[PDB]
């Protein structure tokens, strides 16, 4: 019998993944994402927009 790691078996699995399971999982993902999205929406230095520093080594200490 052909192994689980056979190239032809992998090509068949890729075709199946692209043709049926892909669309089905995309549809379910859209539904769940919509639900979770609905559940979710159920000066620089003193504002935070300017990202600054908070509060062994890679280089040899001089």
Partner RNA sequence: GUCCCUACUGAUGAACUCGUCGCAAUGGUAAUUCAGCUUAGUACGAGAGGAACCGCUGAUUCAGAUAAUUGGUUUUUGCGGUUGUCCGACCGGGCAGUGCCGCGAAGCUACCAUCUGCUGGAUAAUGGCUGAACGCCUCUAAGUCAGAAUCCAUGCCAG
CB of 62 to other proteins, least distance (A): 25
| Of positions 3, 41, 56, 57, contacts other proteins by CB under 8 A | 41
52: which residues sit within 8 A by CB, 6+ positions away?
Answer: 45
Closer by beta carbon to RNA, 3 or else 41: 3
How far apart, in whole angstroms, are the C-alpha atoms of residue 61 and residue 44? Answer: 34
52 makes contact with other proteins (CB under 8 A): yes
Closer by beta carbon to other proteins, 45 or else 62: 45
How far apart, in whole angstroms, are the C-alpha atoms of residue 11 and residue 27? Answer: 24
């Amino acid at each position: 019998a052909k192994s689980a790691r056979a190239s032809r078996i992998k090509e068949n699995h890729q075709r199946f993944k692209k043709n049926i399971a892909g669309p089905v999982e995309a549809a379910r993902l859209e539904r769940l994402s919509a639900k979770l999205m609905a559940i979710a929406q159920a000066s620089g230095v003193k504002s935070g927009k300017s990202i600054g520093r908070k509060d062994s080594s890679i280089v040899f200490p001089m």
